[PDB]
DNA sequence: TGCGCCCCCTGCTGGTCCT
DNA sequence: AGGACCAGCAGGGGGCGCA
């Protein structure tokens, strides 16, 4: 006689299996406790694995690197790297990918809608894996011991963000201000030029012909020959 | 019950692609 | 260039078909 699941469609061979079954699935009482952490599992293969995250041990080594894991299906996956067998395809696009995992990834990024994005919380800026806000978040905004000075100035900044910010603020930005007028330069030789055409200043010019003089006598003597109010052929 | 077998999930990594 | 992108890749853990 088959041994049948009271809540749902299951049958098993052995009592023991049913049992485990209904730990499983129904009950979810596990018995067997871990000595240092708080892991329960329903069978103490579990728990023998589990301890062996614990103790490090790794027993099973890759016959062509160093790479040593504490399961047996971790040696089957890590074999991948070395073959490039590629099991996965993807049913849409019919890509090739190397995890199961990796290809739930792909099909969710690249073929659903309404796909929940992740903001900076320092930063507007929208990242779609959760893992690349991170690194966005370790390589932008995380502090950093030795300032990276400015390519453009002298001022010194401990976060990339703020430096590539600042930096990106000099864009069409004339760095010579010219204090006699408001001409403002930016190749730092017409600015030596335009400070040469101040030199020549004078002030005083004539209402009646083109010509500029520095000294009033020297207008009223030029004014008094060339545009003379009352003067008589 | 033991255990292999496969599937979960998670998150960092290093080359690729888009602006 | 530069950074998001995208697959690669390894960690811990679940259920059960077979012995
Ligand atoms: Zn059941
Ligand atoms: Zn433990
Ligand atoms: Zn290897
Ligand atoms: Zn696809
Ligand atoms: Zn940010
Ligand atoms: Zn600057
Ligand atoms: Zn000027
Ligand atoms: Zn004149």
Do not use: W
């Not at 996956?77 to 849409?92: A, D, F, L, Q, V």
């Amino acid at each position: 006689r088959p041994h049948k699941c009271p809540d749902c469609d299951m049958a098993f061979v052995t009592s023991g299996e049913l049992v485990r079954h209904r730990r499983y699935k129904h009950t979810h009482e596990k018995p067997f406790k871990c000595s240092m952490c708080d892991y329960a599992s329903v069978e103490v293969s579990k728990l023998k694995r589990h301890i062996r995250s614990h103790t490090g041990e790794r027993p099973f080594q890759c016959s062509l690197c160093s790479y040593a894991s504490r399961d047996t299906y971790k040696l089957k996956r890590h074999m991948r790297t070395h073959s490039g067998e590629k099991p996965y395809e993807c049913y849409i696009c019919h890509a090739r990918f190397t995890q199961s995992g990796t290809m739930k990834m792909h099909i969710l990024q690249k073929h659903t809608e309404n796909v929940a994005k992740f903001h900076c919380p320092h930063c507007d800026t929208v990242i779609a894996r959760k893992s690349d806000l991170g690194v966005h978040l370790r390589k932008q905004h995380s502090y950093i011991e030795q300032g990276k000075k400015c390519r453009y100035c002298d001022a010194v900044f401990h976060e990339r963000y703020a430096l590539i910010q600042h930096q990106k603020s000099h864009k069409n930005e004339k760095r010579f201000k010219c204090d006699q007028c408001d001409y403002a330069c930016r190749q730092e030789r017409h600015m030596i030029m335009h400070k040469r055409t101040h030199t020549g200043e004078k002030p005083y010019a004539c209402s009646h012909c083109d010509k500029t003089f520095r000294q009033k006598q020297l207008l009223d003597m030029h004014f008094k020959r060339y545009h003379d109010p009352n003067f008589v052929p």
